[PDB]
Amino acid sequence: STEELFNEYKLTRPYMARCIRCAVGSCHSPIAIEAVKSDGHDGYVRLQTSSQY
Amino acid sequence: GAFGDIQSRTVSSSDLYANTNLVLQRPKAGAIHVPYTQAPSGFEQWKKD
């Protein structure tokens, strides 16, 4: 229902990026977090990761 | 690092003034990444003070 739920996801595809520590050292993992915003007053976090879901 | 480090004439204005003291650094050997240096967001500092 609607392109917002259809999503450009079909065009994008998740990708991988470097993490500082992957446990034992760095690695090129898709879990990598690009940016984090913390402006909401209720304590919720909005994380932007390199993968999609 | 001061209130008004990022300024915009209007909300919809695409042009904006930026003075963050952005300095690029030398990347790590064997690692692909974009190193950088910047002053802390002056908006946050002002919000705290």
TrEMBL record, chain B:
Subcellular locations according to the entry: Host cell membrane; Host cytoplasm; Host nucleus; Virion membrane
Reported function: Provides the signal sequence for the translocation of the precursor of protein E3/E2 to the host endoplasmic reticulum. Furin-cleaved E3 remains associated with spike glycoprotein E1 and mediates pH protection of the latter during the transport via the secretory pathway. After virion release from the host cell, the assembly protein E3 is gradually released in the extracellular space.
Quaternary structure and interacting proteins, as annotated: The precursor of protein E3/E2 and E1 form a heterodimer shortly after synthesis.
Protein name (database record): Structural polyprotein
Species the sequence originates in: Venezuelan equine encephalitis virus (VEEV)
Interval of the full protein contained in this chain: 1011 to 1059 of 1255
